[PDB]
Design a protein around this ligand. Structure first.
Ligand SMILES: [Cu+2]
Ligand SMILES: [Cu+2]
Ligand SMILES: [Cu+2]
Ligand SMILES: [Cu+2]
Ligand SMILES: [Zn+2]
Ligand SMILES: [Zn+2]
Ligand SMILES: [Zn+2]
Ligand SMILES: [Zn+2]
Ligand SMILES: [Zn+2]
Lengths: 153, 153, 153, 153
């Protein structure tokens, strides 16, 4: 059984796009992003705990962290479920990417359905930046765009 | 356990608002709404099956109908899960409403998290209007605003 | 084994006052009110589910209802845990009252600590008003003042 | 699952802000802070034992101290449950911070629900100051703002 989900990303910063999720049974989640309007280079890319946009991207809460770990890189053992690292924006301010991840299921108790994916202004230091925010947020700066992960037909 | 969800409504019409859901354990869901920029009178108010806004409110699919019944009133046995009837908009374009319902859980197999709320242009006839659409949609006309039901707590 | 809690009640309305809670062991909760700046007559008096005042009293959510019952009078089997009925305001717009209730404990899983006590603009119809809001809120109108129930020394 | 709490800060000093708490299962508590109106530099940031605001912040009692230890730094063994160290205020009088800590649960017997967060006038000396108040309050001076930790989700 395939579950499908899609986030339409908006923001006050003119960055836009979609992120498409799929998961067959209880295997990995495939996530395919198409982003525009971003500063060239690395941008923090997170699943946040909430899909509350009452105060734009600021109300989506902290990083999704059911395991109660510190902030890290996707490859790390010591990471949040929602830590999908950096996406690289081209010189035209677009990004197109597929990542596969094992901690962002689309069903069961840790489902990210109805949570928000968030693109950040700045790189995610992956917990290694030695800044006060490194080990909590990765010090990725402003939530320039976010989208609620909605069930797809 | 206390589960919360919220829909932030938007459309092409200059209509806005917030719909707050709460469910304590497996008691009924309380839905609390304040809406603006709507035409005075009754509007059909439903949970639709999908949270896909890639084609705006149109991609949110039909009334959430896990039981495979026809369209009806909230108090009827022959209703969609998503069938929450009419909300009443004042001459000032605003609606203020509280309803309880036990067919829109915020967790488990029939969870509405990551689906959508839609306010329709016209009244829901509650399946009793004897119109060709009465038994599917309640002939509630177009999708004026919708919001993905995002996890809030 | 006595637990003590107190709410300091704030409004936009200039109604204010305090509600003091005590519970010996597993016994009933005693709640003593001193209120001012209120319209003479009966006022809906509820424990709401949340102590969130980010949006003044409107963020305190619905009636505290762990049993998933409908809105009732305190003496009814079919009531919310939060349903403390009506408090009577004198001509001088003050109220002083003591009630005891066994559904608002100050510890355990259904503790009211860190929830909100709310005084409404209008009488609570105790679910017998024959209004659309009777069975959900008792149709008691605006939240004129609320206070977070804080642990007392 | 997910428990949320929120303190809306007030005081005599024009300091404002919101502190949001999230705990997933029995993991650490994330506390996310947005403050304004504060003098620049480090400020003591503590959970106090009580949510009694009848005498403003002074009635919130001492540091939350269920284990009966002395005042210390968050990473110390000998510390109060309520010891969350210093938050830095920029020259513009604002503080934005994310802290995670495993002694401030939002449920069970050591719950901080219905207690208070307090922001102090002065830096927390983390118990190291050699002052008579070092091992009790970290000599962090006045209670410049506080709020009751209200249940939010
Ligand atoms: Cu982020
Ligand atoms: Cu509809
Ligand atoms: Cu009420
Ligand atoms: Cu202190
Ligand atoms: Zn993270
Ligand atoms: Zn229907
Ligand atoms: Zn009630
Ligand atoms: Zn919850
Ligand atoms: Zn201390």
């Amino acid at each position: 059984q395939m579950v499908k989900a899609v986030a339409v990303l908006g923001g006050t910063e003119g960055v836009k796009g979609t992120v498409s999720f799929t998961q067959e049974g209880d295997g990995p989640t495939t996530v395919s992003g198409s982003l525009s309007g971003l500063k060239p280079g690395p941008h923090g890319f997170h699943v946040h705990a909430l899909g509350d946009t009452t105060n734009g991207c600021m109300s989506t809460g902290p990083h999704f962290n059911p395991a109660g770990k510190e902030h890290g890189a996707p490859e790390d053992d010591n990471r949040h479920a929602g830590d999908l690292g950096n996406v690289n924006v081209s010189d035209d301010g677009t990004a197109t990417f597929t990542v596969v991840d094992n901690q962002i299921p689309l069903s069961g108790p840790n489902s990210i359905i109805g949570r928000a994916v968030v693109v950040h202004a700045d790189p995610d230091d992956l917990g290694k930046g030695g800044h006060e925010l490194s080990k909590t947020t990765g010090n990725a700066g402003g939530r320039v765009a976010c989208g609620i992960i909605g069930l797809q037909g």
